[PDB]
Design a protein around this ligand. Sequence first.
Ligand code: NI
Length: 341
Amino acid sequence: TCPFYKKIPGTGFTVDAFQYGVVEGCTAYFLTHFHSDHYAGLSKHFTFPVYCSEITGNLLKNKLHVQEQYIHPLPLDTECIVNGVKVVLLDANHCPGAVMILFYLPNGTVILHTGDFRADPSMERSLLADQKVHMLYLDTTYCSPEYTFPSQQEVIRFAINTAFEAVTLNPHALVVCGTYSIGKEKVFLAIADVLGSKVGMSQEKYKTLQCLNIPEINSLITTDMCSSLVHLLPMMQINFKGLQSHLKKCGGKYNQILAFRPTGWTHSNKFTRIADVIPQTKGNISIYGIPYSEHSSYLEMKRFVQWLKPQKIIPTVNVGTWKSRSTMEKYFREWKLEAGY
Ligand code: NI
């Protein structure tokens, strides 16, 4: 049964609610992004209208085989009427195709559902600037002050400089980057650009990338592993055993691996600066954990919410424990007393 924080009151709508069977009263199912916890339940047998971005609708049709007649892609930054209700899709600064959804209820209430997002000051000049929001359905993944991490730009600078130094010292080093979902494509694309290489990957991953409307993508990726010195592998294989095994397969072209695991936050964030990050090493294999986040830090979250000034907040993440819920409610009240709304 569908939880309350996935239902939009005063409408026939749900958000990211595909694993509950037929939801009673739902006339349109919205999907914020193509991450498995959110699309869980969709398949070629789904027969209700799905509303989403163009990129998400490319992934539904090619990866999950949802039939075309049930996919309703909407342009971003554009007022659209869905089953009698005005909606707008906004870029969420998450993975490719990820959106926030603004719902203009027939009674005058305005609701923002962030989906998963990385808040940014650029959102203060979107179509959100133009009107009041009553209710905020908020991605609270990192809603505690211990969650700090650098900008995406600082993290990519570290990765490019690290990779370029290693391969210029040793032209026979291979770079490997872990993946298990869409998102974080800048990590492997930026490294391959500095090295003058395409990114090599499996046919299944190439297929997924080809759905993403990334400009000039045919110039940047390939399935021919032998022609590439940046390889993508499943995240599970980014360990000493999995990397040793991969280096065997390359036929003595390479004699060293430098590997990257983009994680979210890890507790080594509470002590170490990005500049000071060091790898784990075993013989000719080195593994870097790099804190590349596609969710808001605590400070970015707090800035967005204090700017928006919602009347009510509904968290969508960390809702399963009383301790989490009480922590989050305490910070919401702090923010509201400090800013004065
Ligand atoms: Ni996500």
